Structures are given as C-alpha cells and as structure tokens.
Amino acid sequence: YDYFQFTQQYQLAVCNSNRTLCKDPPDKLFTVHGLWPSNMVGPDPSKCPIKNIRKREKLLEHQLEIIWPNVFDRTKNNLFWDKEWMKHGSCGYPTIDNENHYFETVIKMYISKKQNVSRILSKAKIEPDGKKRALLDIENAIRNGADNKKPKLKCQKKGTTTELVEITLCSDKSGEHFIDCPHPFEPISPHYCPTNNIKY
Template identity: 60%
Template sequence: MGITGMIYMFTMVFSLIVLILSSSTVGYDYFQFTQQYQPAVCNSNPTPCNDPPEKLFTVHGLWPSNKNGPDPEKCKNIQMNSQKIGNMAAQLEIIWPNVLNRTDHVGFWEREWLKHGTCGYPTIRDDMHYLKTVIKMYITQKQNVSAILAKAMIQPNGQNRSLVDIENAIRSGTNNMKPKFKCQKNTRTTTELVEVTLCRDRDLTKFINCPQPPQGSRYLCPADVQY
C-alpha cells in the first residue's frame, strides 16, 4: 500500500472513530418529562396493581426525544450502579414509584436509565445524575403535575374534566408551553387521563411546546377526560 493509500485509510478510520464517539451527543433534540396518574395506570394495565394506587401524578420517566424520526433508546450498555442510590431512594420511591409493582422500584429506575437515560449525554452525565435531575425537576423546580393542577383547583375526584381547563392549568406552570396528553378508555363512555408530558429543550434549561401525537393515535384525548 502506498503513502496515499495509507493516508486515506488513516483518514477513514479516524473519521469513523470520531463518528462513534460523537454519536451519543447528537441523538436527541429535546426531553420529555412524563408523569403518570397512578389510578389510570392501574385501570389500563391488564394485570392489576399489587398495591392500591395513590391519587397522584408521579414520574414515568425523563426521555431524550426527537421532534422528527425515532427517539433514541439504549444508547449505551451501562448498567445503573444501584448501590450508589443511597439516601435518594426515599425521595425516589415517592416521586418515581413502580406503580405496577412496588416491590421493584429499583428495577424500574434501572430500566428507565438503560432505555432512556443512557441517551441523554451530555446533558445527563451518568446514572446518578439522571436520578438527581428527576428529583430536581419534580421537587425543586416544582414540575409536579398534581401540584400544578391542585393550584388551579383541579382535584382528582374521578369527575369528567374539560381537557382545555387541564391544559390551561398546566400551561400556567410551564411558561405557557403546550403539554402532551395520553388517555385511555376505561369504559365505553369514559376516557381517563393517564399521562401528562412536559417538554424541555435539549439542555433542560427551558420549557418548549411538546410535539403532538399524530392524528389517529389510540392515545389521543377527547374534549372531556376523567381525572
């Protein structure tokens, strides 16, 4: 192989290495902070919850996402070091419980980290930073859907509510940015609000309007929902 060929091969190998190293930093353009309403989650799950749900929106996950194209998943095979969770566990069990199986909170966080958190670099630095970021968003920064709705006098009493009223209440806590909703029919006539998603920019510094699910999605919400 001549000098020219060696230079060409070196350039190609170097370019490939750079692409691999940088791929984890360009795979998303915003974050979804999704919270689930515990009773609705239990009602929509084929297997009953093993403990009574609380009438609260608690964290489902913090997900790096793309406005166009598929969202990244399982970007690195880096397992969560659960031994480091320590004192955070008490807070996490309240704000980020495994609603379906409360004997497996840690397993839930581990799965969320592996599927979603590993894709959040450089904004999410590592597994413990992922957990700390969720705690900060939900508690310190008051991005708690239940608290936002309660402030607007919208209480979880199982009545039908105007989706517009719910949206306006949430907008009041997110600089007037549009959330995303997920609903599920629990009877022929009643549809429950299952999830609310707040969207943040790539750096988690500000709220943005959430991209909306396509028309025809089975999780779209009607004008009135049960909450």
C-alpha cells in the same frame, strides 16, 4: 437527542389501564413515568453506549420510591429504575452525566422546579375529584405552570368513561426551558384525549 420529554402518570388511572394488576394500592397522584432524551424527527434514541457505571445510594432510592415508584409492584423498583437509566437516561449525555445524576435531575424537576403535575393542576383548582372535565381546562392549567408551553396528554377509554392518564412537559436540549411538545396523539388513537368529558 434534540429535547426532553418529562412524562408523569396518574397512578389511579394507570392501575385501571390493563390486564396487569397493580399489587400495591395507587395514590390519586401524578408521579414520574419517564425522562426521555427525544428527537424532533423520527424515533427517539434508546440504549445509548454508557460512559460510566455507578451505584445508587439508599437515600436516592428512598426519594424515587415516592417520586418514581413502579406502581405495579414496588418490590421490582430496582430493576425498573435500572431499565429507565439504561434505555433512556443513557442517551442524555452530557446534560445527564451518569445514573445518579439522571435520577437527581428528575427529582430536581419534580420537587425543586415544582413540576409535580398534581401540584400544577391543584394550583389551577383541579383536584383528583373524579369529575368530567374539558380538555382545554386541563391544558390551560398545565400551560400556566409551564411557561405557556403545550403539554402532551394521554387518556384511556374504559367503557363509556375516558380518563386522563399521563401528562408530559417538554423542554429544550439543556432541560432548562420548556418547549411545546411536538407529536400529540391523533384522534383515531385510543390514547388520544378528546375535547370534552375527560375524567380526573
């Protein structure tokens, strides 16, 4: 892999995204959607051969229930985390050593390193108040909490309302320094965030 994408999702909007109902009530919070070893050119790696097989402890799972829930059905959390490890975590060796280290690394980014996107936005005076916002104000807020580096944003359109859904912070191969995210969505895409009137 070349770099990492750490993607967080705003639960309220995810649960308004498609024909799959969230059986559990969402919070107005950004929690983790993925940590993806990624490639600068072409497709990202997927399902890389593993180097070890490990069991998760309850305490790790309890933190992931809070920081990385399956927002559609929390009863499917274990199989959901197993797939994130198998599809993505497995491709980050040796920076990511094993399954437990993969999830501990995500918790370290979100909590210790203050990468909780709800917190970064709140520090810039942007709360989940359901207001229409300019794209640059959301981008400026994230860059101010991420070493000036440009995030990748995902939005969705619902009727006449476009809402913010995901924010990705990208980092270098070691995951120790942020980098600008390559590959932003093109304007024709229904995942593209327009310059104005984004609801959050």
